[PDB]
Amino acid sequence: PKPILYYDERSPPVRSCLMLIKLLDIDVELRFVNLFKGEQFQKDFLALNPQHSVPTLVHGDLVLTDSHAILIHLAEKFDEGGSLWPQEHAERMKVLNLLLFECSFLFRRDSDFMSAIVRQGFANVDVAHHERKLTEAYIIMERYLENSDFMAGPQLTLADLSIVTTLSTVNLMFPLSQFPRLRRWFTAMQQLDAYEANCSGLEKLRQTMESVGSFQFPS
Template sequence: MTPKLYYADLSPAVRGTLLAIKALGIDVELKPVNLMAGEHLTPEYLKLNPLHTVPTLEDGDFVIWDSHAINTYLVGKYGKNDSLYPKDLQKRAVIDQRLYFDVGILFPRVGAIVGSLLREGAKTVSKDKADLLTQGNYYLIPDLIALLFS
């Protein structure tokens, strides 16, 4: 049975999962979710994912959401080797460190900025939201991106 990925193109998390799927070379049925129309809030979608987020993966009778969890699951189940998520604990710890940094620090801070622009109608980024990226020296975005992908 082909796994189904519920997704929205505008989601950076979805794009990360699509990259993992491509790197693994697996076939996935793509199921678009129109966030602007509220499809992620329908009773059917909430049965799959009570957090109403994308991406959500349905693999047979197993359902999981959150791109980080989906990606590591896909690598574990469909990976031909451990190059994307090594068994070596130190190498895996570095990958986990970057996954947790993304989910715990980077994504919420960038999300606050994007959310104010998209959902609140802001025309500029407020100083308090911009300051979120400078706390802890996170203002070095090019260096940060290089670190995440090194």
Template sequence: MLSGHNKSKPGTVVHFNNSHCAMGNCMENESVVPVNNPTFDPKTINHTIDVYFYPLSPPSRAALMLIKALGIKHNVKIVNIMAGEQMTPEFLKMNPMHTVPTINDGGFILWDSHVIMKYLVEQYAKDDSLYPKDPKKGAIVNQRLHFNTTTLFPKLLDYCVPVLFNNEEPDPNKATKFEELLNILDGFLKNQSWVAGDNLTIADFAIITVVATAEIKMPIDLYYLPGSAPCRAVLLAAKAVGVELNLKLTDLMKGEHLTPEFIKINPQHTIPTMVDNGFALWESRAIMTYLADQYGKNDALYPKDPKKRALVDQRLYFDIGTLYARFADYYYPVIFGGAEYEPAKLEKIKDAFKFLEIFLEGQDFVAGNQLTLADLSLLATVTTFEAVNFDLSPYKNVVNWLARAKAAAPGYEEANGKGAVIFKQMVENLTKK
């Protein structure tokens, strides 16, 4: 089924949000099948079956699962298809199609996982429950196997192979096509426990390995600079939500945000920019709310209650439209353009901090008494003010909140503290007289 490919991209795996079919709950661990069930009591054999196997191959795993479930004595022989071991003269002599899985049952050579599974049940299983002899029941099992081999598995490969082995960006259209097939699979499973009826069959063994492969999570790409306050706000949100980010350093000074490849992802060529399984998004607060909605274990960071959420949104807009905007208006012309400070702009910053002081009156965090995305966003901004030595001491509520938020934010130092230091060092280098 699965033949050789080129070198894989390290750490890249695949996930589809709706791939939670009913049988996945029954077979979460592919190797866990009840071998003490009388259904799986095999005929006695006096030899060991050789199984030529590659761990990343869903068809290989399906065949090995069944062999283990049947309790057949076997010898696993790993074939590293990345190293071309399926192309050796010895392997080609055994299987001229050079595919895995392949079995050697006492000199009888067989390949193709579905054929192998049918053979093993007919040859060694106590009864025919895994592959019924009844024409109608057997036909349904065959139909599900053909659905897997001609439709489900090829569409998974069509999506995965360019990402895993050619370093291409995920194609959302291909992801959608695979998800449509999962919806069909959900239809098969409606009102029944297994894909071909109310009994486990070899069709379940074949399909569960494909679905399990699709359930693995792909790290989210984040194009960022560690010193950037908006980027640090996203890092804080990701830590709080508990999602892994694949960080892609994007050097604005070198124009890496202006390359054709980056502009194709984000025509506004801004950072942070996120790519989640082909879905591209920019603007830090939009990314933060997406991560909380998509991956949050609960709604504490971004409440679903309309009034509570509106208050969090108001604070987020206050940050981007007022506090951070006034920071940029006052400091950036000096830091990056060598301009003189304008006192009137400094007064606007002080007014913004007076607003924040009022927001915090009588409560622990900016939108209530629990940490939300608004705190994380403002935390990145206020620590940026700290980095340029802005005097926060007149704002007692802000000072107390800042200490509280730093302590409450998961992974604060890694997500924000180090980046704020980098920003401070950059400012000092750029403003040396």
């Protein structure tokens, strides 16, 4: 049967999957899991995904509990022969490598910063520390873009979808003034029709964060 996506659009990895789904016009059933109400700890979802995280994809008997696996799976099933998840091995490995950068480096550091806001209160966060950690991510991405026009090569791939949602989230706080290649790439991503899938969730994330913490991100 058709894929089922457990989601909360405020989640950047969720938005990456939403962008792919829109890009490929994949017919998917959406099941909302409200992270703010802690619905990821509901007995049935916990049983389904012990990591209590979104996105989660159920496709037949297959249960995927990580956005990067979901991106790759959906690409291989609904974009067979496509260039998003390249056929050529070396090209595919480059995309995979960036997907892991997003998971291990960019998202980890953005998560550290955003969780700190929630836990400590906006005014009490060591912003200088997190500015350093996240600017380091900006620097790395700028380096990757000095070689290729997109993150993992000359064409749009799954890596760009994964990275742009988290990047847009980091950019709620930290400006991209000093990173021209990154800004050019980000602007190009925003021109994509699929980028609309990132829009609603990013603003709902901003709304929820700002309401909970009684603060405002810099304009």
